[PDB]
Amino acid sequence: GSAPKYIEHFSKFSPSPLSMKQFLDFGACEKTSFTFLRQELPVRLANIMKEINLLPDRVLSTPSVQLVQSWYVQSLLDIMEFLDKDPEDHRTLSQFTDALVTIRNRHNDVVPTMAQGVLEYKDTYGDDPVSNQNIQYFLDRFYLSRISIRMLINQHTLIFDPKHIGSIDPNCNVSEVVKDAYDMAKLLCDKYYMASPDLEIQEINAANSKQPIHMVYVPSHLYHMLFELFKNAMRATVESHESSLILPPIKVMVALGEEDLSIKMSDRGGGVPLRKIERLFSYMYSTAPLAGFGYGLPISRLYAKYFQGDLQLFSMEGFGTDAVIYLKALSTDSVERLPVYNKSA
Ligand SMILES: COc1cc2c(cc1OC)[C@H](c1cccnc1)N(C(=O)c1ccc(O)cc1O)CC2
Ligand SMILES: CC(C)c1ccc(COc2ccc(CC(=O)NCCN)cc2Cl)cc1
């Protein structure tokens, strides 16, 4: 077999970041998506596969890594089939879509699979800060790459099976998605705890204080992030108050500025000492109910970063925690953030 040759070839190429605009202007032909993706997925697969291969043998040799390395290989080979093939042939196109869906399914379990390798490494080699930064360095890049690939595939499979453009809503109502995520977190919270804090949403449209706040975004991504933040904020409010009688609401502010769309989630759950914040974003130190232990925070932070956003926690121990999602607001500033293989190895 030739996998290491292909990995070599395509890891010479750079992933090509797309903007929201570019993603909408595919709402262009299917032939164009096909010829784009049969180049670009190999480039993006190979770039990460190359980085996996740089991991020390004691990590690389583990079953978890070998297993997802084997998925990445099959998936690269699956797309090779189509490199010679003819876009004009409508059956090349429908077989390609078959092929992407198969690939997407194959990769569904990477997160907990890679999680299992983190746990194995913790017990096998220990949990020193240097182990921590390396796992954090590696997985932020790996998971961000994974997000970027799922985005491409979904965009194709959802368009080439009109208002939403695949996973993108050009008129995304932010408050609508906040409530959706709230309602769902409340459901689970009431289940496990038989009480839930209430929601208050305030909006601030600086430039247009009347108009409700719409953006171009990928709502599932925003949902993912708000869901995780609600779960945390509900767990924290409820547990800090099981003696007490009142449950303070969770307050969400949605601010639209010239360049930032900011979503703050303010809970009154007794907060986190500054010392313990960074650990909350750590894959290693969050590996072992509603919320309490999982990869929600770090991965929610990646979804934010993916379109040049961010996601920050600021607490006040004894008072509560502010979680802020920062997004771009303008589709022009909303460009893929990709980890690229190069010098910095
Ligand atoms: C690892 O140690 C701790 C973790 C977390 C907290 C405190 C920790 O030690 C003191 C804190 C919390 C937990 C329970 C009740 N009230 C607040 N949290 C938060 O304030 C919080 C964190 C994230 C978030 O999105 C929302 C929050 O309210 C939970 C984590
Ligand atoms: C399974 C996944 C999540 C995983 C698990 C564990 C790791 C940890 O990888 C480490 C740990 C320590 C060092 C320092 C060092 O001594 N460097 C030289 C070693 N070549 C480097 C790396 Cl790449 C990464 C990814």
Ligand SMILES: [Mg+2]
């Ligand atoms: Mg932070």
